[PDB]
Amino acid sequence: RRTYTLADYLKNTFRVKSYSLRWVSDSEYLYKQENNILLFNAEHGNSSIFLENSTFEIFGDSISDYSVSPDRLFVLLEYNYVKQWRHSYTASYSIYDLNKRQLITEEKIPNNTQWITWSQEGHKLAYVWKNDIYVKIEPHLPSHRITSTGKENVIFNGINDWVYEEEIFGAYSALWWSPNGTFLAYAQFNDTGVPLIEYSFYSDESLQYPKTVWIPYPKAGAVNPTVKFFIVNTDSLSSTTTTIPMQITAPASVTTGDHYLCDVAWVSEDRISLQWLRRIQNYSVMAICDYDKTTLVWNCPTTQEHIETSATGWCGRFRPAEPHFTSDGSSFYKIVSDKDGYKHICQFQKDRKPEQVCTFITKGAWEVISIEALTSDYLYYISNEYKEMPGGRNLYKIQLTDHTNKKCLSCDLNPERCQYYSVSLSKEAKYYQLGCRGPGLPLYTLHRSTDQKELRVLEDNSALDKMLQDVQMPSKKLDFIVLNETRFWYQMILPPHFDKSKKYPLLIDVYAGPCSQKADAAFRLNWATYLASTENIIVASFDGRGSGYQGDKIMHAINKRLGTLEVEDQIEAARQFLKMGFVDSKRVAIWGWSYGGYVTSMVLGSGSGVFKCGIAVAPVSRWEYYDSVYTERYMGLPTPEDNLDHYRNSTVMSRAENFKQVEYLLIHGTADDNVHFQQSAQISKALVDAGVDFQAMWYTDEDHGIASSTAHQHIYSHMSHFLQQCFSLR
Amino acid sequence: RRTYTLADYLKNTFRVKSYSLRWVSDSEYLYKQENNILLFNAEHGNSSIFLENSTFEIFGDSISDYSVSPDRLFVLLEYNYVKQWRHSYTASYSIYDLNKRQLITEEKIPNNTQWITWSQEGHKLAYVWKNDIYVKIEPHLPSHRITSTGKENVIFNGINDWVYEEEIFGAYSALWWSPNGTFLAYAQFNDTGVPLIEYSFYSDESLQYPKTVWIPYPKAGAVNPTVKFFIVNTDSLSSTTTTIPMQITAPASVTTGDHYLCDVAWVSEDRISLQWLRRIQNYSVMAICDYDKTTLVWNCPTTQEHIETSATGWCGRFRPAEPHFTSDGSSFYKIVSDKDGYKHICQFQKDRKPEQVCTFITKGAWEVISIEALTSDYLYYISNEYKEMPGGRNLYKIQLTDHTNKKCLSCDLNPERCQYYSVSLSKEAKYYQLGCRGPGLPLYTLHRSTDQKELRVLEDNSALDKMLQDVQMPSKKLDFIVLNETRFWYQMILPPHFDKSKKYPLLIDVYAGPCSQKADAAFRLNWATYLASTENIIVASFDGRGSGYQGDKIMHAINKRLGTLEVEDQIEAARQFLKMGFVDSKRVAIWGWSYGGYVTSMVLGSGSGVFKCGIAVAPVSRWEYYDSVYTERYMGLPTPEDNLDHYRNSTVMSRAENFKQVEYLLIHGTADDNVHFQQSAQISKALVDAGVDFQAMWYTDEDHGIASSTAHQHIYSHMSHFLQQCFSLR
Ligand SMILES: O=C(NC[C@@H]1CN[C@H](C(=O)N2CCSC2)C1)c1cscn1
């Protein structure tokens, strides 16, 4: 009869396993097993050693990661990894010659590379270093410099500046090899007019004077970085000292004022797709460009333009969805909101057609989460259609030739244990691995695409299961409540022997930012686990307005006015939970991180009287302090000509007074490059001026994730005691 | 039966009055009465209006202060005051013509003056603006620019750079008019090689990007600013476009390496005294310089050199004491430690004499606090000699011609109420005002110097007294305990009906920096008042080793090793208090501000087990982070060639572990330009790495004094609750 200890969480006592494979072909994949890369044969367990427990140790214990060239002839060995922002980081590299069996040592790769990648074909390498792009046709050969305009915090070649890396593309990379690797496309950003933010860094206690880190960061309404798209011909490098890249200029309907680059997608080797967005993400354009062999130039005829629009708010969830072209690249499928505001898959022809550019292949009050593969006859995708559970994930598949031959492939499998799947099809969809994150313990299995025959079970968490036997684990209810005639899902982490008759303290867990989803059918062992399994606290989350994958009516509901409906609904939801009986109204709390810290703060400061205390970690306190791309997408510009009013109305500090009725815990990281601390500094200052006592805690040199080992443990222990004091436990 | 509420303290319910006069002659003074400057006649209450409730309101309600020219013909009206560091500040000025009865409006004075002052004679004005000195022979006349090398944060002309303003001279000023105002001496500092510290400033919540303030600040061992001394002839300004100042170069025995300027003192109009100090304040020189009429140059013959030394530690308390010359300037009296290490008054002759430069006029196990006046026959001073109370203050006087004719002038007056006096003699010591801060309510009275006849009582706090009647005020015990055979004074703020038999919680109040004194006979209404009068907590302070005015044996005891004996003795003292019975050993705490925050932290981290909790406000965590002038004076240089070891041993973070046995509250100001926050940031980080939970609180944009109105209230309310939680009260 043991409970899930806070130490069980902090020291990761119970490990949850998974099967992360790397498809090498349409029939084999790679897998890391005891620091040995093994090549497996989907169909038969047939394995084989690809790289040894060995190799990886020459570069000591700093071997961060590995990347095998597509022709399996070489392997990139990453080491001396150094983080920088959410996705950026620099490392050192070594090419290992599989065949020659040894580390290539001649034309080595710079000891501080910002980014590197193989081509999609052979062993071509493109890497950014010192903000400049370099190409190596083959591992042993010398490095060819592609750009030279590169300059720290000013000119970025092939990598994204801070805001792009964070808000547009999900990563640091701004490179794109064409299939067959003839061309190499890339973006270049000029951060010149972009203002700087400058926080202090204290480093070791031996540093006598703290450093100052500055970052070109555009806050709402500020001058944004600029872009340019280039494509350089890789096949000529050996015959010149310098090659001249060809530039593609964004479509006219976007160039009049500020704008951004949305997505890059190679159709074939003479056709590329680029998506552009206006600073006011009300409008989006996806041009298709063809390579003219004669005049050696790329053309993007308005005839192949394609426009995406939104009268309710903005485009896509975070950005227009990505196109998926056919082989002959004559058509493509893309996820776009239909007439009812539901994100669904529809067809397009390279050439736009007057208000009929689309033809939906999907309908319903549910949404297609993402397209996973496009066979010459089938379209594999993932949706939350099944059982009308917006919080569930299932793998479907439609026959192109017959849009009726639509079939779910994971719905049956384990309806009890699995309702939240992740997929991964082989190079040509011959096999597909399933990742069950579903209610129960994560279950990984691979199947033969043809008939779905489950070849074998890659990973069932029997080990984890065996251990969780001797522990009083809490349960998780995933249902919905109905407000103003609409379903709104929520989830509750119920403490062990949960008796519906008794009264328990409630803790609302929040985020609730645009298009977010806190209520889902995925298994997790987090802090809330400990909170219910040992403190008997009910941890609940509620996806209200401006959220998830339930149509734009619900998501766009927040448009032009953050800090409104999503906050309110969070309070309503608490009301409902109370009316559900088992909640001790005298002990209701609410905490949130990032955007969640904002809502938590806005809720505590609403004077609704429904909450006793709360904790906001690295919250946003007013939208002018947050970056441009994100904020403006939901708020527009902070100008009297636009939405200045809603900007100034949604301030946390403007609700300082109402905090007198609450125990508040404000936590923030000193080196938070995302939500600047300036944000919390402005909150504390507002409460101090209001004469409201509260509790604060800064984390020296910590990120926006306060994720360093010692800090991570410290912050959760601290919040634990805060709740214990607040809930009269401890 | 009402107690002294925390609100009584925060809202300053009970005002303590005083009589701050401004001697205008040897027989009249100025006094602000209901916003009216009144001229009084010492001898007879005879008054008279000098400036009206009026005048002061033309400049609205921003009239910060006033300064009357010595010939009482004009008045400087200060307004638009803006703080900057401990003593620096900028303001706007207006000269009011008393005679012509109106504000001079012609050659006005710059709207951002950094410093201004009248001559000692007529109506000459010298002011610094934009780091340059300017002179105006008369209020109506045009401004003459004296320097032009001035440049922000680089070259300071007539004002001190940060470290000088804070650690050497007690103010912003670096100007010195000669008597008769012929010459104007000044210092010039070059902050060129001095490193910068850069903290953030968030300002109003409307500022989208926080500012960055940088200050040339030398931390221990860093490159210090440089100096130069000049004297310019004021009488020529009208006959030139530019005058050429004459430079005095520091004495050779100081120029070999880094050094500072200690004090400037005009002897007569052709003789000036300058004191210099080596970077290692082991040595000090006071040259006397004469003006050569022929070659128009100042000479500082080594024959008039005068050397001050210390084999135990450093010179003076914070700096060599100031000289007090006779009329004919043939001799001077200065406070210097005698053979036994006791700060006493002794005579000097302009010319140095081989190891006999002095002749003491005072002896004993007590010290002369300060010299107050030097008549042609009498020397008025202040000491803690009486009743052998190092924490008491009394005004004495010695006859020059007969050093036996020594007499105390305040010892009798009110032995019960007054034991801590402040003085203020008229221009030629004909009258002297006494300021009783003594145990009881502050009592101000003026006396006729001749026979001491108390002419009248300027201010007795009858009003305050009448109000404190209906309140249960706590008492104050000022005694001493004896350790290792030596007296060590302490003081206790005992809660109201204090019953020696019961047990009360104890709170140690600390500072204990070199030459400090927390145990004295002065009346006060602070936080500790509320803490005893309403929380029944015993607030006690203990002046241990490295302190007060009890000889260098006690003060220099800490030399080259801060964070040692002064910490220990603070713990010993608590032991003693416990042995005194009336202390609930299960509830002993300790808090301190600034240096006190350091000791508090060092004590809590000593694992002595004697303290339950504590609060450190803007503490120092390791001496390398603190400025040079101060640190090095007691620690030397942080180099292996000197005292690097004691620097690294006295770290607060090196005692992180021991904090697991204590409830700790760390508080710090965001814009602390003195003790950088970097200091607390390094502490929190150390505890986080050690896995020690604790409590923190930052004050946005607050100073080292966290003295803004709202912050001041907030911080004390917060500390109050922290003690209440810790002491199980509240
Ligand atoms: O007031 C004087 N010295 C006292 C020193 C001036 N600044 C030091 C300070 O601010 N500390 C804060 C943390 S520990 C030290 C104390 C002083 C006046 S004239 C020469 N010295």
Q: What is the C-alpha to C-alpha distance for residues B692 and B697, in angstroms, rounded to an integer?
A: 16
Q: Do A205 and B686 touch (CB under 8 A)?
A: yes
Decide: A694 and A684 in contact? Cβ < 8 Å: yes
* Among the listed residues B600, B606, B580, B568, the one whose alpha carbon sits nearest the alpha carbon of residue B723: B600
Tell me, in angstroms, the distance from the centre of ligand 1 to residue B342's CA: 22
- Which method was used? X-ray
Chain A: give the shortest CA distance to residue B728, in Å.
13
Tell me, in angstroms, the distance from the centre of ligand 1 to residue B196's CA: 20
Task: Write the CATH number of the domain with boundaries A16-461.
Answer: 2.140.10.30
β-strands A226-233, A211-216: how paired?
unpaired
Pick from A200, A621, A698: which is nearest to B684 by CB? Answer: A698
Cβ atoms < 10 Å from Cβ of A312: 14
Q: What is the C-alpha to C-alpha distance for residues B567 and B411, in angstroms, rounded to an integer?
A: 34
Tell me, in angstroms, the distance from the centre of ligand 1 to residue B514's CA: 10
How far apart, in Å, are the Cα atoms of B174 and each of B133, B150, B189? Answer: 10, 13, 10
Per-residue tokens: A510: 């929040």
Which of B206, B207, B208 best probes binding to A when mutated, by most A CB atoms within 10 angstroms?
B208
Half-sphere exposure for A562 (CA within 13 Å, toward CB) = 30
In chain B, where does the domain assigned CATH 3.40.50.1820 lie? 1-12+470-730
**Rama region for B721: left / alpha / beta (φ>0; ψ in -120 to 50; rest):** alpha
Contacts of A699 in chain B (CB under 8 A): 684, 688
Q: Map residue A399 onto helix, strand or coil.
A: strand
Contacts of B653 in chain A (CB under 8 A): 205
Chain B: give the shortest CA distance to residue A696, in Å.
5
How far apart, in Å, are the Cα atoms of B5 and each of A636, B437, B439, B508? Answer: 50, 23, 21, 20
Burial class (CB in 10 A: 0-12, 13-18, 19+), A156: buried
Nearest CA in chain B to A647: B206
* Among the listed residues A229, A217, A232, the one whose alpha carbon sits nearest the alpha carbon of residue A254: A229
Q: What is the C-alpha to C-alpha distance for residues A687 and A689, in angstroms, rounded to an integer?
A: 5
Exposure letters B139-155 (e unless 16+ CB within 10 A, then b): bebebbebbeebeeebb
What backbone torsions phi and psi does residue A717 show, to the nearest 5 degrees?
-65, -45
Amino acid present at B359: T
Half-sphere exposure for A45 (CA within 13 Å, toward CB) = 3
* Cα angle value B627/B633/B637 (rounded, 5°): 70
Q: Do A718 and B197 touch (CB under 8 A)?
A: no
Burial class (CB in 10 A: 0-12, 13-18, 19+), A111: exposed
Q: What is the C-alpha to C-alpha distance for residues A76 and A109, in angstroms, rounded to an integer?
A: 10
Burial class (CB in 10 A: 0-12, 13-18, 19+), B693: middle
Partnered with residue B277 across adjacent β-strands are: B260, B284
Q: What is the C-alpha to C-alpha distance for residues A316 and A233, in angstroms, rounded to an integer?
A: 33
Exposure letters A67-105 (e unless 16+ CB within 10 A, then b): ebbbebbbbbbbbbeeeebbebbbbbbbbbbbeeeeebe
β-strands B613-617, B663-669: how paired?
parallel
Sign of CA dihedral B507, B511, B517, B520: negative
- SS3 letters for B554-601? HHHHHCCCCCCHHHHHHHHHHHHHHHCCCEEEEEEEEEEECHHHHHHH
Chain B: give the shortest CA distance to residue A143, in Å.
41
Amino acid present at A212: T
A1-12+470-730: CATH, from 3.40.50.300, 3.40.50.1820, 3.90.1150.10, 3.50.50.60: 3.40.50.1820
Q: What is the C-alpha to C-alpha distance for residues B481 and B577, in angstroms, rounded to an integer?
A: 9
Resolution for the entry shown, Å: 3.0
Q: Map residue A309 onto helix, strand or coil.
A: strand
Contacts of B626 in chain A (CB under 8 A): none
Pick from A208, A625, A697: which is nearest to B696 by CB? Answer: A697
Residue carrying structure tokens 């002297």: B432
Sign of CA dihedral B723, B727, B728, B730: negative
Q: What is the C-alpha to C-alpha distance for residues A255 and B113, in angstroms, rounded to an integer?
A: 51
Pocket test for ligand 1, best of B162, B163, B165, B166 (most atoms within 8 A of CB): B166
Strands of the A421-422 sheet, one edge to the other:
A421-422, A431-436, A443-448, A454-459
In chain B, where does the domain assigned CATH 2.140.10.30 lie? 16-461
Q: What is the C-alpha to C-alpha distance for residues B442 and A296, in angstroms, rounded to an integer?
A: 94
Partnered with residue B304 across adjacent β-strands are: none
Residue carrying structure tokens 């701004």: A174
Which of B6, B196, B205 best probes binding to A when mutated, by most A CB atoms within 10 angstroms?
B205
β-strands A538-542, A504-510: how paired?
parallel
Q: Which residues of B are catalytic?
A: 594, 672, 704
Q: What is the C-alpha to C-alpha distance for residues B253 and B300, in angstroms, rounded to an integer?
A: 13
* Cα angle value A234/A240/A244 (rounded, 5°): 60
Cβ atoms < 10 Å from Cβ of B385: 22
What backbone torsions phi and psi does residue B332 show, to the nearest 5 degrees?
-155, 155
Decide: B699 and B713 in contact? Cβ < 8 Å: no
Strands of the A343-349 sheet, one edge to the other:
A324-325, A331-337, A343-349
The residues, any chain, with a CB within 8 Å of residue B156's CB and separated by 6 or more, are B131, B150, B174, B188, B189, B191
> What DSSP state is assigned to residue A360?
B
Q: Map residue A553 onto helix, strand or coil.
A: helix
Chain A: give the shortest CA distance to residue B388, in Å.
44
Q: Do B210 and A195 touch (CB under 8 A)?
A: no
Pocket test for ligand 1, best of B86, B172, B260, B318 (most atoms within 8 A of CB): B318
Q: What is the C-alpha to C-alpha distance for residues B100 and B123, in angstroms, rounded to an integer?
A: 15
Q: Could you tell me how many CB contacts below 8 A there are between chain A and chain B?
A: 117
* Among the listed residues B106, B92, B93, the one whose alpha carbon sits nearest the alpha carbon of residue B140: B106
Per-residue tokens: B549: 């005015």
Per-residue tokens: B101: 């009865």
